[PDB]
Design a protein around this ligand. Structure first.
Ligand SMILES: [Zn+2]
Length: 46
């Protein structure tokens, strides 16, 4: 008899790598990108 109060009203989007809490979703999904090993034209041209 543990039924009753239930609702996914409160939502929180917390990254995985950095584990930073955000406000919206689109903000996170896109952010996650930042975590991509291998960036061309970064530290040195070649
Ligand atoms: Zn992150």
């Amino acid at each position: 008899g543990s039924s009753g109060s239930s609702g996914q009203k409160e939502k929180c989007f917390k990254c995985n790598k950095c584990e930073k809490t955000f406000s919206c979703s689109k903000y996170l999904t896109q952010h996650e990108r930042i975590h991509t090993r291998g960036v061309k034209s970064g530290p040195s041209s070649g």
